Amino acid sequence: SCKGRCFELQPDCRCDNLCKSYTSCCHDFDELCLKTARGWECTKDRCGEVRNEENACHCSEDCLARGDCCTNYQVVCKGESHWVDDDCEEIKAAECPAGFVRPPLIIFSVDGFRASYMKKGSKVMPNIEKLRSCGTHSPYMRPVYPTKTFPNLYTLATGLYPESHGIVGNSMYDPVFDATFHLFNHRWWGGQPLWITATKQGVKAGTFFWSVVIPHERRILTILQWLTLPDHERPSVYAFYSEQPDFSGHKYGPFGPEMTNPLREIDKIVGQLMDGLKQLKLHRCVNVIFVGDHGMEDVTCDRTEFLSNYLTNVDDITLVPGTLGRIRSKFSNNAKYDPKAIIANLTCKKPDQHFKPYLKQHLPKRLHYANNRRIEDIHLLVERRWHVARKPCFFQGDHGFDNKVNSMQTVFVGYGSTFKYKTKVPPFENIELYNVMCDLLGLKPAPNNGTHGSLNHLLRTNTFRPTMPEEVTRPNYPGIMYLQSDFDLGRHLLYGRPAVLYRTRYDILYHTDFESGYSEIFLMPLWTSYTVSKQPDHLTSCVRPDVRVSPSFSQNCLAYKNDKQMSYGFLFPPYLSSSPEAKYDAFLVTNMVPMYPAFKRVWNYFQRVLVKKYASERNGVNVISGPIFDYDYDGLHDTEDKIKQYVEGSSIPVPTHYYSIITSCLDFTQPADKCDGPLSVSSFILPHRPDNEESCNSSEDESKWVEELMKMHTARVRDIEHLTSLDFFRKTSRSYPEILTLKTYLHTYE
Ligand SMILES: O=C(O)CCN1C(=O)[C@@H]2Cc3c(n(Cc4ccc(F)cc4)c4ccccc34)CN2C1=O
Ligand SMILES: O=C(O)CCN1C(=O)[C@@H]2Cc3c(n(Cc4ccc(F)cc4)c4ccccc34)CN2C1=O
Ligand SMILES: *[C@@H]1O[C@H](CO)[C@@H](O[C@@H]2O[C@H](CO)[C@@H](O)[C@H](O)[C@H]2NC(C)=O)[C@H](O)[C@H]1NC(C)=O
Ligand SMILES: [Ca+2]
Ligand code: NA
Ligand code: NA
Ligand SMILES: [Zn+2]
Ligand SMILES: [Zn+2]
């Protein structure tokens, strides 16, 4: 029996909340623990009360002490007020009763709560509105790809991309075992979640999981109940979860009028939470995070592309369907199965095609969706509002699309003593929360993909002091060291010189129009920096040796002549040179990089047309460009070990991508090279591909397609730091936490 052991935190008859899922509860759990009687609200008559065990909650004078009161008791029978009726009072300091070592954290998570419901629900969710308004909040929070529940909830809790924590979807095929696994035990998965991190550091955690038949009102009383327990038992961190509004969203669509009740209902539970805390004097002591795993889009049966309309033998493939596609051979010894053919077959075959196929390594890097062996090589990015099935109602809403999509954005509100008061912060990525939650609990966070510091502007106190990483390889500064005859060939640095964070050998090179860091190992620049202010020739096939760099560690024009696939281009573009004299610097062999003919069309468009437009538009730009090597698609700078391809019969490694970081003043009335304030930045990581299969209008003028591809491969600065092992923005006039925020920014074009 459960006697009074009920909802306990720890062979026998079981009393914990998760027992009902494992069907291991004692026969009397439904009698003692899950009482439903009289409802979840007091009334005038209920007050002055027999502390009747039969009830769900009590309105007796006993009530307050035992810690099992109905959440609106004070409001109804001691004259006090609903917390939503009070005016925002700032909380300059945690107001906890004696013997609390720290402010409790309550994570209030909701499935499928799209960011728009905040504007178009103000009227119907007043308690949530009061959290938003009095607390700290962002316009939206960005989930991770894929925008599905389990992958997002576990990232939330761990700080890791799905590729790394391992929950890449609900069914996953492991080719090591040739078996499929259907999704819960935290422990077999990657990363350290929050409830563990806290436990290992002597901070007691409550459950982050509930048995679905336990109704929401009971879960709240349970948390308030636990909060009255004594110091040696009481947990410091708790978690509520709601399947709504995701559940109704699938059924009715995010804009269905049927959505209105479910949000009101979620708001009621958030009401009980606050009314309950308040009547335990804990409403200015606990920190609450109201947070969402992802959003919801309109998607119906009739918007469904079918693979059988593209592929000869569709019974030879296995497809995970829906708002993303994952394709895999169904049969093990099938020599008829050809990934290159499949992708070709699925590539721009209709003008209005509602998905695009990709091998995972060609997916835009911002998705971080490749480095896991249960991610099938062939992936389909599905257009928003659409589905993908194998071959030929329930639903009008779904999610799982590209996480830059708006319908997929989600919410974050931070209320409490440690959060700023009435503050609006910019949108961030949910991988950043794990680090913040550790901060609120005094924990050293486990290694994750967050960037610790980048969210210090959300917090009143408890900010941790991030430190710039150390240069690992100091630069060389060659002077004029060689003769033209030794060779057998054929202001611009506004934010600090970036710092090389791995062991290598590089020369820093200066020119009038640009500054560069040249790797004597990779035979090209690691980075090329140049400012262009707001305000040609027939030398195409000439290159000059750089006299500051030995011919051993320079590229040559023989390799590029004898490579019928590969060509070369410049990181600093000759077109932007400041004078006929200076133009010769842009043609130094130290400025060449390997570039497929197809990539040049993108790259020339960019250097010739978009940079000067960007400069006009933003009042100057600083531009840092370099190559990236990521052949193992793990999002990190490759070692020489990992390089698969080279320019014909040479040591010149071919980059898998090319980055650029484009930087200006937030105050566009000050030019780029004379800021006094915050910075503005947008970056991208363009894949380096022999063809333009990815862009459906590549046969047209670059004005009609290059800029669309670029928007698609937008990237955070931080992404490029991981992929290049550099560190940018080391010598600005801004604080290091502000700069971390700048670096986590991704410029979405929506
Ligand atoms: O070291 C190695 O490579 C193999 C060793 N090994 C393990 O001992 C655990 C066992 C286990 C794992 N998972 C997660 C998983 C999910 C989908 C899959 F297709 C494969 C695994 C589980 C989930 C439920 C119950 C047990 C497990 C992952 N493990 C290993 O890979
Ligand atoms: O109560 C219900 O309506 C259904 C029971 N249920 C769930 O379906 C989800 C599944 C899930 C939960 N968590 C923990 C969590 C909670 C809040 C966060 F901000 C982050 C993580 C997960 C972690 C990884 C993967 C799956 C999950 C919580 N759930 C339930 O109790
Ligand atoms: C995301 O975070 C994880 C954890 O910090 C990084 O993964 C670790 O990588 C190291 C070195 O490659 C391995 O030895 C560890 O086993 C990895 N840990 C886990 C839990 O997977 C990962 O590199 C980060 N990803 C990016 C793109 O920055
Ligand atoms: Ca790599
Ligand atoms: Na060539
Ligand atoms: Na094309
Ligand atoms: Zn969800
Ligand atoms: Zn869903």
mmCIF file of N, CA, C and O in Angstrom, residues 19 44 99 107 183 190 212 220 269 286 350 362 385 453 575 610 740:
data_model
loop_
_atom_site.group_PDB
_atom_site.id
_atom_site.type_symbol
_atom_site.label_atom_id
_atom_site.label_comp_id
_atom_site.label_asym_id
_atom_site.label_seq_id
_atom_site.Cartn_x
_atom_site.Cartn_y
_atom_site.Cartn_z
ATOM 1 N N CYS A 19 5.084 5.423 -11.934
ATOM 2 C CA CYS A 19 4.569 4.071 -11.723
ATOM 3 C C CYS A 19 3.397 3.732 -12.660
ATOM 4 O O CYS A 19 3.371 2.651 -13.237
ATOM 5 N N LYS A 44 -17.293 29.446 -1.779
ATOM 6 C CA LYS A 44 -17.613 30.065 -0.472
ATOM 7 C C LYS A 44 -17.916 29.005 0.600
ATOM 8 O O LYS A 44 -17.295 28.984 1.671
ATOM 9 N N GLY A 99 16.340 28.482 5.212
ATOM 10 C CA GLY A 99 16.817 27.132 4.934
ATOM 11 C C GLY A 99 16.785 26.684 3.482
ATOM 12 O O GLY A 99 17.202 25.557 3.187
ATOM 13 N N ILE A 107 10.478 24.299 -14.614
ATOM 14 C CA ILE A 107 10.456 24.338 -16.051
ATOM 15 C C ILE A 107 9.089 23.896 -16.499
ATOM 16 O O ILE A 107 8.665 22.762 -16.261
ATOM 17 N N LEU A 183 11.113 4.670 -30.289
ATOM 18 C CA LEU A 183 11.134 5.299 -28.958
ATOM 19 C C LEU A 183 9.859 5.069 -28.141
ATOM 20 O O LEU A 183 8.771 5.273 -28.645
ATOM 21 N N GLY A 190 22.986 10.030 -25.588
ATOM 22 C CA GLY A 190 24.102 10.942 -25.417
ATOM 23 C C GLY A 190 23.873 12.052 -24.386
ATOM 24 O O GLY A 190 22.749 12.269 -23.866
ATOM 25 N N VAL A 212 0.978 9.743 -18.246
ATOM 26 C CA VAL A 212 0.052 10.591 -18.981
ATOM 27 C C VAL A 212 -1.303 10.651 -18.320
ATOM 28 O O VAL A 212 -1.955 11.663 -18.406
ATOM 29 N N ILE A 220 0.472 19.837 -10.648
ATOM 30 C CA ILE A 220 0.821 21.133 -10.095
ATOM 31 C C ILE A 220 0.784 21.069 -8.583
ATOM 32 O O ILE A 220 1.757 21.456 -7.919
ATOM 33 N N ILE A 269 -3.632 26.328 -15.981
ATOM 34 C CA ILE A 269 -2.675 25.555 -15.229
ATOM 35 C C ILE A 269 -1.550 26.485 -14.815
ATOM 36 O O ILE A 269 -1.101 26.435 -13.694
ATOM 37 N N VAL A 286 10.850 31.488 -6.429
ATOM 38 C CA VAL A 286 11.064 30.561 -7.529
ATOM 39 C C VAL A 286 11.233 31.269 -8.885
ATOM 40 O O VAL A 286 10.648 32.334 -9.125
ATOM 41 N N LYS A 350 9.952 18.929 -61.340
ATOM 42 C CA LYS A 350 8.739 19.738 -61.576
ATOM 43 C C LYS A 350 9.151 21.151 -61.329
ATOM 44 O O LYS A 350 10.108 21.382 -60.592
ATOM 45 N N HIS A 362 25.309 17.484 -47.602
ATOM 46 C CA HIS A 362 25.059 18.695 -48.371
ATOM 47 C C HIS A 362 23.962 19.557 -47.796
ATOM 48 O O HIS A 362 23.715 20.654 -48.297
ATOM 49 N N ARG A 385 4.317 23.563 -45.105
ATOM 50 C CA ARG A 385 2.922 23.178 -45.448
ATOM 51 C C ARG A 385 2.746 21.851 -46.164
ATOM 52 O O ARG A 385 1.628 21.403 -46.349
ATOM 53 N N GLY A 453 27.688 32.205 -21.780
ATOM 54 C CA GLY A 453 27.957 33.634 -21.786
ATOM 55 C C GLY A 453 26.967 34.340 -22.665
ATOM 56 O O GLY A 453 26.441 35.395 -22.284
ATOM 57 N N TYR A 575 38.101 42.458 -58.536
ATOM 58 C CA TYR A 575 37.120 43.454 -58.926
ATOM 59 C C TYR A 575 37.012 44.605 -57.912
ATOM 60 O O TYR A 575 36.726 45.743 -58.278
ATOM 61 N N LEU A 610 27.006 41.437 -54.923
ATOM 62 C CA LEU A 610 26.372 41.522 -53.623
ATOM 63 C C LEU A 610 27.169 42.320 -52.582
ATOM 64 O O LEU A 610 26.598 43.076 -51.813
ATOM 65 N N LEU A 740 29.573 37.230 -27.637
ATOM 66 C CA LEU A 740 29.094 35.865 -27.748
ATOM 67 C C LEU A 740 27.677 35.849 -28.331
ATOM 68 O O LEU A 740 27.377 35.031 -29.195
#
